[PDB]
Design an enzyme around this catalytic site. Sequence first.
Site, PDB file in Angstrom:
ATOM      1  N   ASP A  57     154.370  61.046 -59.313  1.00 52.70           N
ATOM      2  CA  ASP A  57     154.391  61.613 -57.948  1.00 52.70           C
ATOM      3  C   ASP A  57     153.113  61.246 -57.196  1.00 52.70           C
ATOM      4  OD1 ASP A  57     156.634  62.856 -58.635  1.00 52.70           O
ATOM      5  OD2 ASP A  57     155.821  64.841 -58.891  1.00 52.70           O
ATOM      6  N   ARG A  58     153.194  61.325 -55.900  1.00 54.38           N
ATOM      7  CA  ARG A  58     152.034  61.142 -55.076  1.00 54.38           C
ATOM      8  C   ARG A  58     150.828  62.062 -55.456  1.00 54.38           C
ATOM      9  NH1 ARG A  58     150.896  63.699 -50.698  1.00 54.38           N
ATOM     10  NH2 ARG A  58     153.114  64.027 -50.060  1.00 54.38           N
TER      11      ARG A  58
END
Length: 227
Positions: free
Chosen positions: A52-53
């Site tokens: 994920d970011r």
Amino acid sequence: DVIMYEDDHILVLNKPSGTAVHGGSGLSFGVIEGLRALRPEARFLELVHRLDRDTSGVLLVAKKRSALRSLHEQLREKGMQKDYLALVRGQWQSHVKSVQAPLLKNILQSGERIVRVSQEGKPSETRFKVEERYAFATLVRCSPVTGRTHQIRVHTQYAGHPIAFDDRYGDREFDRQLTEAGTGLNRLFLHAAALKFTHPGTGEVMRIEAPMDEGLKRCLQKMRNAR
């Protein structure tokens, strides 16, 4: 360093929280375009998996087709030990060694992902091991056996213990509690801490471990002292 291990076959990064692995559906880039820019003339560069970011930590990037061939297969066979460290709300129950809830992924207008537990979802399994217990949260080693998008975040939320600073699945009151405790924390507390895999060229088993950033460390120091 961001680059933690490199050879002719693989590049292993310590991904920072806050940067996506690749660009979205619009006008953005992430880690891997960012990498093709500091190394134009790379012959082959492909992410082996995603993070994920706002997740940090171990990220494997293939540099040869034969390397990606190998790593894809090790993922499909669930052969790798991916261990993450998550700071979760309240007290993780000691008998809960796994969550087995199926997960359905949908894509929002922004290109953001949202994932929900649903019988219409894909088979998903995460294991858990309590590492450190605090006044109002637990540090948990989370090992996704399957490799679904947002699997740890949703599984922890599902079990009643969402991850700290998880903006989509998380609990703003817990984040409030962390801020008033002085932790400094200002990002998703999820870290890809260790990855064990077979090196595609040597055939040697390899364990790579990413250090947590100072934000995470200061958070844990504070929680160790909270009461």
